[PDB]
Design a binder for this molecule. Structure first.
Ligand code: O2D
Length: 435
């Protein structure tokens, strides 16, 4: 009750204060055999999180740490295996039984308690994002079984509050994925969630559209810019896992990107998001066309869309802001692979009119970026920025392998940059081998 409450408070302290466990998931995993009973006292945890003190309060950091530990215990309980990077087998009868029992407990519990947790910590993005990892583990059918419809409403109310209050890409993506899990994985609740999710979108599409018009008709305000970006961010987040094509979003993103090209003065984040959103619209347009039996004119309308967007991403290579370039590049190396001749695989030869070969000028520019932005002269931010450039190359690399860009002019650049390995590598190798 409060005995487990002391232990858990001290366990949060031992995690934070000692750098003996760096990963929460690993700490939990390590203790799991010995301290399962304690680590699945979820009523204790939510209590510690939700109650007000008598004495000694929790500090903001330790609350955060508790939530993270809690989410890790939930996973391990639900999944019944160690986390990614500690894995290795059959569940025994009793282990399976415990898994079903634990899943039931945490679902009933968290259905009721997750809306409350989200309410209290609604503005703490890192906490909210961490809490919204929880529904993926629920036994969704219990939203019907328990006559628990009141708490699904409750959750959806809070998810609405979160998206409405936040712009962080983690928070938003966490929300999107959550609607995703509540939607498609039970018919009973599907109709209810779809109604709440579609009403949410609507409110933002209207705000976005009004804001798009505000900005473009306009001397443009900081408000105008915050409204366009803020709303767009929400929609782009969702547009990855939700098919928002019924709202013609591609049109207003295209206006923001063309205005930015013409007059040069569109904020980098609006441009980056507008690109990402348009891209997501396009992929979803494709999915509807693959799966349906499309006519000639369907294909020809999608083609014109794609040609007009590849034109835009090309032009965006020349944007001063290097995040735009990277995004534009990323999308080019995505799209030119997608609308390659691969598109006519699996008896899909109807799609020929959608195939695109990038011209010489575009291949030259897709070489240019690599010379300028993968291969550059000159803590935690640099190990991250490296893996990005690594991905930018790996995405370019696919175009080389299938002769979509000039495979010889590419390799020439790879020569030029590997020169010091070919000229002095052996000598540097053997030298370091004797020290
Ligand atoms: O947060 C905003 C507006 C917001 C729009 C959605 C995400 C980008 C930023 N502005 N800002 C204030 N101080 N620095 C930037």
């Amino acid at each position: 009750m409060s005995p487990n409450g002391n232990l858990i408070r001290m366990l949060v302290l031992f995690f934070l204060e000692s750098e003996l466990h760096e990963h929460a998931a690993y700490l939990v995993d390590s203790l799991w055999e010995s301290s399962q009973e304690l680590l699945k006292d979820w009523e204790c945890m939510t209590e510690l999180l939700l109650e007000e003190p008598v004495e000694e309060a929790m500090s903001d950091r330790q609350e955060s740490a508790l939530i993270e530990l809690m989410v890790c215990t939930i996973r391990q309980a639900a999944e019944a295996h160690p986390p990614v990077g500690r894995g290795t087998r059959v569940l025994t009868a009793k282990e399976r039984k415990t898994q079903i029992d634990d899943r039931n407990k945490l679902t009933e519990h968290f259905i009721i308690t997750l809306p409350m947790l989200l309410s209290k910590y609604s503005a703490d993005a890192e906490k909210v994002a961490n809490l919204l990892q929880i529904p993926q583990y629920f036994d969704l059918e219990i939203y019907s079984t328990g006559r628990m419809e009141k708490h699904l409403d409750a959750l959806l109310k809070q998810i609405k509050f979160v998206v409405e209050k936040h712009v962080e890409s983690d928070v938003l993506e966490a929300c999107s994925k959550t609607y995703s899990i509540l939607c498609s994985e039970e018919y009973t609740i599907q109709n209810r969630v779809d109604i709440a999710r579609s009403q949410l979108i609507d409110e933002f599409v209207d705000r976005f559209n009004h804001s798009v018009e505000d900005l473009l008709q306009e001397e443009a305000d900081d408000d105008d810019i915050y409204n366009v970006l803020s709303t767009l961010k929400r929609l782009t987040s969702f547009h990855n896992a939700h098919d928002l094509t019924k709202w013609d979003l591609f049109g207003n993103c295209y206006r923001l990107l063309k205005t930015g090209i013409e007059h040069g003065a569109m904020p980098e984040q609006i441009v980056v998001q507008a690109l990402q959103c348009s891209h997501y619209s396009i992929l979803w347009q494709l999915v509807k066309i693959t799966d349906g039996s499309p006519s000639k004119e369907d294909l020809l309308v999608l083609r014109k869309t794609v040609k007009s967007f590849l034109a835009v991403c090309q032009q965006c290579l020349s944007n001063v802001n290097t995040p735009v370039k990277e995004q534009a590049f990323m999308l080019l190396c995505d799209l030119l692979m997608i609308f390659s001749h691969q598109l006519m695989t699996g008896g899909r030869e109807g799609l020929q009119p959608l195939v695109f070969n990038p011209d010489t000028g575009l291949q030259s520019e897709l070489l240019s970026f690599v010379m300028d932005h993968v291969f550059i002269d000159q803590e935690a931010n640099k190990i991250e920025a490296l893996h990005k450039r690594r991905n930018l190359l790996a995405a370019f690399s696919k175009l080389i392998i299938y002769d979509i860009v000039d495979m010889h002019a590419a390799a020439d650049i790879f020569k030029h940059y590997m020169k010091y390995y070919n000229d002095y590598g052996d000598i540097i190798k053997e030298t370091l081998s004797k020290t």
